[PDB]
Amino acid sequence: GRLIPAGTGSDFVRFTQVVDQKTLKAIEEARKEAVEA
């Protein structure tokens, strides 16, 4: 009753994320913040 090995359940696509350029600059701002003192 597990997800099918074949299809959208492909190891090649089971993992794929999406972004808005707005959330793109938001995460890099998180990286900028990493600079200590």
Binding site residues, other proteins, CB under 8 A? 1, 7-8, 10, 12-24, 26-27, 30
Q: Do the beta carbons of residue 9 and residue 3 sit within 8 Å?
A: yes
Tell me which of Mg ion, other proteins, none is bound by residue 34, counting a contact when its beta carbon lies within the kind-specific cut-off of 5 to 8 angstroms.
none
The site map against Mg ion for 2-21 (x = CB under 5 A) is: x------------x------
Q: Which among 4, 25, 1, 26 is positioned nearest to 14, based on CA atoms? A: 4
Q: Which residues bind Mg ion (CB under 5 A)?
A: 2, 15
